Every structure is written in structure tokens, then in C-alpha cells.
Design a protein around this ligand. Structure first.
Ligand code: BR
Ligand code: BR
Lengths: 132, 103
């Protein structure tokens, strides 16, 4: 496991909501690096886009749902992919009441076009994988 | 990654026409610091979520926070958007969860 690249700096004026999403991104990086992934934070990459991480080489983005509405969580991911051009998503359940199990079921019974690897981190720091 | 989910009561074409003026009126934010996706027609799922927050959505588009150092401009970006869609209603949900707009 490993952790490099500059970690995300949270601007002082950011409110509680925005602040909490940046916290959880910096936290997902550390949690994964300690689980054996090689994690680069805020990697330089070609596109106009600036991804959150690189996880064993693959560009990844953090998504830290506060909602517990599993369907909506899927809808959200789906659109982050279709409109935002996200592919591989770290889904951090720190502030969500939605079970890792239920997310996997949802993403499987309704595939999401474009969606890459999904890594779930539950409230206890347990990693599950949902593969492309 | 932080994304503003933006639902509009107006149709896709008009929405886009309006977004051109925004892009032209706020080149600072919208060339690099924030990225504005193309507008799409709202499907059933987006319409459902918009309607829980008061709004009948016809179109939808996304605004991504591309420069993390500008994370504190979300509320000002939100306001700029409410104002550049004068001719209609807009709901803005940060990461499709947190309402940044009134009502
Ligand atoms: Br900081
Ligand atoms: Br909820």
C-alpha cells in the first residue's frame, strides 16, 4: 500500500456540506492506501478534468453520499458518469445509512452505462468491490 | 469530486442558449475552475428527484468543481446560475443531495 501526491486543501470559507465532502475525499485516500492500494491524490492528467485519485494506475473519483436513498445514489453516480465523465468511483459510506450490500444489488440489477470499477468503503472501513 | 446537479423547468435548447451567455459573462469561473456539462433532457429519474423539491424539470445539466481551491465559490456560482435562468425555475442540488437554492 502507498499514498502520494498532494492531499486536498479545503478553503476556509467552504461551509459544512462542502467541507465534509473534501474531508471524506482526503479520508478515502488514507483508508485505501492502508488497505494496500497505491493511491495518488490530485494526479496530473491530460484532459481538462482533474480527477480525485489514481488507484493502482486507474483514475478514480470520490463520492461521499449523505443521502441514504440507494436508488438516488445510483441515479447520482449514473449522471456523474454520463454528464460528468466519471468512470471509476470510490463510494464512501461515512455519512450514509445505505448498506454496501444494497448499493451492489442496485448497480447490478440496472447496469449504469459507462460505469467503471466501484470501490465501496463502509462505515467501519471495510472495502467491497463492484466490478465493471 | 463535487458536482452541482442543476434541474431546469425550461427545455434543453433554451437552457443551452442561456448557458452560453453565462459562459460568456463569467469566463473566470467557467473556463477551468468549474466545468459546465452539456444540457440534456431530464429522464424519469431526474424528474422524480426534481419534483420532490418542488420543480417540474424538463432539462438537466451538471456543474463540476474542477479546481479544488475554488470550493468556496459554490454559493456564488449557484447564485450566478439562478440569475442567468431568469425566464425559468432552477433547482440546484450539490451532489444531488444538498439544496443550494431557495424553496
Ligand atoms: Br487544508
Ligand atoms: Br434521505
Amino acid at each position: 500500500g502507498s499514498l502520494s501526491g498532494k492531499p486536498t486543501q479545503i478553503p476556509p470559507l467552504s461551509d459544512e456540506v462542502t467541507t465534509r465532502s473534501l474531508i471524506r475525499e482526503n479520508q478515502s485516500a488514507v483508508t485505501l492506501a492502508n488497505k494496500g492500494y497505491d493511491v495518488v491524490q490530485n494526479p496530473e492528467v491530460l484532459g481538462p478534468k482533474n480527477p480525485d485519485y489514481t488507484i493502482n494506475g486507474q483514475v478514480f473519483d470520490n463520492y461521499a453520499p449523505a443521502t441514504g436513498n440507494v436508488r438516488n445514489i445510483a441515479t447520482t453516480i449514473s449522471n456523474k458518469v454520463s454528464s460528468g465523465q466519471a468512470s471509476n468511483i470510490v463510494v464512501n459510506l461515512a455519512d450514509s445509512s445505505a448498506s454496501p450490500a444494497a448499493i451492489e444489488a442496485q448497480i447490478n440489477s440496472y447496469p449504469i452505462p459507462g460505469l467503471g470499477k466501484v470501490i465501496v468503503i463502509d462505515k467501519l472501513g471495510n472495502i467491497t468491490i463492484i466490478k465493471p | 469530486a463535487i458536482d452541482l446537479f442543476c434541474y431546469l423547468s425550461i427545455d434543453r435548447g433554451a437552457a443551452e442558449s442561456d448557458l452560453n451567455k453565462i459562459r460568456s459573462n463569467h469566463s473566470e469561473l467557467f473556463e477551468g475552475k468549474f466545468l459546465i456539462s452539456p444540457v440534456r433532457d431530464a429522464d424519469f429519474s431526474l424528474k422524480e428527484i426534481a419534483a420532490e423539491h418542488g420543480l417540474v424539470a424538463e432539462s438537466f445539466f451538471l456543474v463540476s468543481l474542477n479546481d479544488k481551491n475554488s470550493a468556496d465559490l459554490i454559493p456564488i456560482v449557484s447564485k450566478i446560475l439562478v440569475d442567468g435562468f431568469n425566464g425559468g425555475a432552477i433547482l440546484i442540488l450539490q451532489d444531488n443531495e444538498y439544496r443550494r437554492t431557495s424553496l
